[PDB]
Symmetry: C3
Subunit: 277 residues, 3 copies
């Protein structure tokens, strides 16, 4: 069961000690990172939580994934420190997580600064699988790191349009769009009106997705009644986020200069994706 944040580490050379009984979340998160073509993952460990940061290849999307120490089975970190992980190196490791593993344990030791330990346990046969992954002390992408500030509950006022999609709905919408376009217009008139997602390709195909019941997608709008909100957004990274099916239910927030924020939470994991322009 879940004991949360510990005052002292079970092992003594431990700078980080983490244990969690849903290792499948790491698999799906790293499938997301693969889909974004992230080459290197930035990791911040603090005494209260571990955060994974990355950009997509186009550098336009920012991903921040937080795992809350108080909501995992065991958590200890001595202080604030950073690690760099080559994503390709760990891809197959995280993809190897399946139903046979009921625990993931992560350890980082003072006396082995370039190693990160991942331990998977199969309890049916007392099998323990230990990975020693070479990691580095990373140069910090400060723009990426500070994007976290730009996703506080308080900072989300200038987001006049927001709604929720299930994983299935998000995947469907952006798969359907991606079939024919890289760009989509999001439009909504002020007031009690439908949400429009649409595009036009001259002399071939135009497509229009209209959501007639705001209530059914939990849409909230503060668009002034007489105004039209209309932004044009890129959808590549959204397909990635969708397919990765990491969550359950995804909150989507739009801002008038075209930034799009996707948020989902599921137990200990909080996933944020911010895409600009």
């Amino acid at each position: 069961e879940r004991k949360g944040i510990l005052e002292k580490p079970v092992r003594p050379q431990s700078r980080l000690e983490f244990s969690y009984d849903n290792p499948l979340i790491f698999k799906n998160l790293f499938i997301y990172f693969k889909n974004l073509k992230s080459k290197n993952i930035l990791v911040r460990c603090t005494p209260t939580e571990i955060t994974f940061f990355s950009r997509d290849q186009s550098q336009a999307s920012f991903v921040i994934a937080t795992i809350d120490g108080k909501n995992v089975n065991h958590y200890y970190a001595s202080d604030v420190f950073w690690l760099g992980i080559n994503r390709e190196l760990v891809e197959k490791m995280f993809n190897s997580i399946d139903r046979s593993f009921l625990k993931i344990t992560i350890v980082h030791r003072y006396d082995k600064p370039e190693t990160l330990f991942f331990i998977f346990t199969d309890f049916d046969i007392d099998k323990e699988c230990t990975y020693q992954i070479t990691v580095s002390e990373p140069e910090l992408d400060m723009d990426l790191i500070e994007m976290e500030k730009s996703i506080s509950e308080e900072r989300l006022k200038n987001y006049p349009l927001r709604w929720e999609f299930t994983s299935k709905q998000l995947k469907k919408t952006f798969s359907d769009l991606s079939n024919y376009t890289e760009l989509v217009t999001i439009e909504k008139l002020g007031g009690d009106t439908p949400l429009h997602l649409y595009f036009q390709k001259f002399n071939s195909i135009s497509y229009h997705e209209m959501y007639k019941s705001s209530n059914k997608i939990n849409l909230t709008s503060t668009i002034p009644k007489s105004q039209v909100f209309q932004i044009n957004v890129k959808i590549a990274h959204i397909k990635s986020l969708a397919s990765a099916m990491v969550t359950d239910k995804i909150r989507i927030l739009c801002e008038e200069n075209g930034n799009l924020i996707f948020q989902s939470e599921m137990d200990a994991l909080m996933l944020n994706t911010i895409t600009l322009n």
Copy 2:
């Protein structure tokens, strides 16, 4: 529920108005067209039904797919007119049909002669997806069109050999054959005898499929008792028809100069495939 053919269109500029609560049939039919490497689909709309015509790439197979107006939820057409659809343009649209869509609506308007409208509805969340597809007024392949006459119930006398396969059986037989050959011999002696499907590849492999019980595959024969019926037929297009699993139960008819007709019906859709030589 199903209201069939209407006297007047709900919308007024409508030359065609079509609605149907099993949109999955369009998906499977267009998977068939893709498998046949059809580049362009010919469409005839009349006040009683809509028919889709195509040839396969080899031009040897003729496909005629009819959707009966009286058996759909809503149908209206002003007169007889023709439309041409680029198959590749609409491929992803039709492939996007899934369980979330409970209705497909098709509209063609007088004042927009180069547009065909496809509307899909998700009733769980009041989501409406509207495609505007560029279409053309087609030059008519008259040989293709008149192949329809060559599939009337009356015209099927000179077919002395016929039987039925389930979708599963058809797929199995022509997948098994396609593994090793492009051509198969169909042979049946007059009288109460087994059906043979077979081929020979010198110094590698010969294969023989024998159906010992005519009753179990609903075989009917008018081959004179003392005669042998034997034709050699190409099977590529048949694999396509099979894999597309559009139907349930497929009637197969053979003629002595080697033409092969496949027919299946399921609610509003009637699918005919004629292959020559």
Copy 3:
């Protein structure tokens, strides 16, 4: 039902007559042969059983698959004779075995020395599928054939380390390993100790699989208490054996000069894989 070995063949020109009601075993065995990149299969028929021999492409692994006549539905062979089968020729035939076939029959006739007959029966519709496969009188790989002697119950004394994996466990272990390495160290200290599977790749990743409960994997050891057993083995062929999921439960035996033997039995089939170095 199972009548076992017959004194006389139903047909009279038969040198071999074989029938069996689990044809799926042939499919999975030939998937194994495909995974090993076996080009030619050696077949020994005797009056008591039929044996399939092959090497993998690297020639380091030896596969011996025996089907016991007394445990099949019908078996007859006149004497000891050998056949050679091109694996690629028969690949699609064996892959075509599915749920619709409840019987496989194999026949070899005196008067047709270069033909091997495979007959599959679908009893739902009285359909009989007969393959005539060109085969040859093979030059004998005597090293391969005599590897059978090196797998007698008696010869397995100098195997001080052995345990059992389910199909799922074997696939998991060698898929996990194959992600990152071609070679693995198997290590076990004498006495009541854990089994180690591990490797090291400098400056990227090391991996260690430890089995803490010998009982749970049915491990038996005769390693002297004060000694360490340690061998380095190649794993490619093991992935093949695993994925082919031919069995249920697989016995693994290790010898101090690095040979690894895998054995599984399921009804009439006994499968042995010996890999050297």
